[PDB]
């Protein structure tokens, strides 16, 4: 049915000043009967709308710097940034408007590469104030790590927890290019009070082994 646009890679870690290339492949030819190929590229910065960079295959949009260029076939396309600047970080999307319905790629995140940095791991028991409210949230904090990929697992008296934790991740830090992550495990107070040992086990590329932070109540 609808034209599928597939972007590669999903995540593109680069250094400022590097050349960068993002590809888009279409499940149908985007060559229109009028001879134009309606394949467009956007950049979406955090908290903004997408902004047009390249239109109709290779035309640079008004106001877009010369470091951006587009090329390709009727089904295979490439966006190139000759030298990446900080202003270029964000999510890149391809889009086709040759055929109705118009469709978009899934996005490619351009981020800053840096050397591996293991997380600093901190654990917070629930407050007495919250225990009085009938709920218990235990928080695990992974601070200043790279790359973004990390596994956090909760163990309560050695039982693996599944489905009762939620994770949130910051944007990449402007100064040190790291991420931080909170993992929040939520129990009813009744459940919380029946158990003794609360542990978050963290796996990350920057660590030799998994690290476990825990407390005993």
């Amino acid at each position: 049915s609808d034209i599928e646009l597939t972007q590669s890679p999903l995540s593109l870690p680069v250094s400022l000043g590097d050349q960068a290339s993002i590809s888009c492949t279409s499940s149908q030819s985007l060559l229109h009967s009028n001879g134009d190929t309606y394949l467009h590229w956007y950049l979406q910065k955090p908290g903004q709308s997408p902004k047009l960079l390249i239109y109709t295959l290779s035309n640079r949009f008004s106001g877009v710097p010369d470091r951006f260029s587009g090329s390709g076939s009727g089904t295979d396309f490439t966006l190139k940034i000759s030298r990446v600047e900080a202003a270029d970080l964000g999510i890149y999307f391809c889009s086709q408007t040759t055929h109705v319905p118009y469709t978009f790629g899934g996005g490619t995140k351009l981020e800053i590469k840096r050397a591996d940095a293991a997380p600093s791991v901190f654990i917070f028991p629930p407050s007495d104030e919250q225990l009085k409210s009938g709920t218990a949230s235990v928080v695990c904090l992974l601070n200043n790590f790279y790359p973004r990929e990390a596994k956090v697992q909760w163990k309560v008296d050695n039982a693996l927890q599944s489905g009762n934790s939620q994770e949130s991740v910051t944007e990449q830090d402007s100064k040190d290019s790291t991420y931080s992550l909170s993992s929040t495990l939520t129990l009813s107070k009744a459940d919380y009070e029946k158990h003794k040992v609360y542990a978050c086990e963290v796996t990350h590329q920057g660590l030799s082994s998994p690290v476990t932070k825990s407390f005993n109540r």
Partner: protein, 216 residues
């Protein structure tokens, strides 16, 4: 290119309808069309439909036909999209866009939040520093800002004095329909008990303001 000014955030119950608008403006003799685009966590970017502002001719993505109706008020040069029978899958940012042969511009986006939750101020809980929150001179502390609706809440530390090393995490939507986030800061271990750390929380929709001291 045409300048686009979209209407403000909408919060509605499941089953409700919403009308979004997009004021257009420009000195251009370029033929242009107007489009609406959905951006959701579940589906990414999706084109809804297009409309020719000169004659009102409209063409839809079959997925949105009947869900969305596009119109233009030619006198005000304002484009409208009416969305009906709303469900949680309709919660998204909706953009109005323009296209010409030489490109196009996108409006700012209008967030539509479809939920049965009522407005509710947060509970604020300390994330106390301890031996479990210290890493060789460096201690972490925070505040859990839990069970509020709608977004956003604002959090500052020490009435705005303390910005360095602060991470205020994106909010998560809980299965209750209420939001939760944490705000953390890393500080000197030696400062604890000496320096006060207070998280200042403000949830404007409920007019909930709370200053919470966090300590061992």
């Amino acid at each position: 290119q045409v300048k686009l000014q979209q209407s403000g955030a909408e919060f509605v119950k499941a089953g409700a309808s919403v009308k979004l608008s997009c004021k257009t403006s420009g000195y251009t003799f370029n033929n242009y069309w107007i489009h609406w685009v959905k951006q959701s966590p579940g589906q990414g970017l999706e084109w809804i439909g297009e409309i020719d502002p000169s004659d009102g001719y409209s063409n839809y993505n079959q997925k949105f036909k009947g869900k969305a109706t596009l119109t233009v008020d030619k006198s005000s040069s304002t484009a409208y999209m009416h969305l009906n029978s709303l469900t949680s899958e309709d919660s998204a940012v909706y953009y109005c866009t323009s296209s010409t042969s030489v490109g196009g511009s996108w409006g700012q986006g209008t967030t539509v939040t479809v939920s049965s939750a009522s407005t509710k101020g947060p509970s604020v809980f300390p994330l106390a520093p301890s031996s479990k929150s210290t890493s060789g001179g460096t201690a972490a502390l925070g505040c859990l800002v839990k069970d509020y609706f709608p977004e956003p809440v604002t959090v500052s530390w020490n009435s705005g004095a303390l910005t360095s090393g602060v991470h205020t995490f994106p909010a998560v939507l809980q299965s209750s329909g209420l939001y939760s986030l944490s705000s953390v800061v890393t500080v000197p271990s030696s400062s604890l008990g000496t320096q006060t750390y207070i998280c200042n929380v403000n949830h404007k929709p409920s007019n909930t303001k709370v200053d919470k001291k966090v300590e061992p």
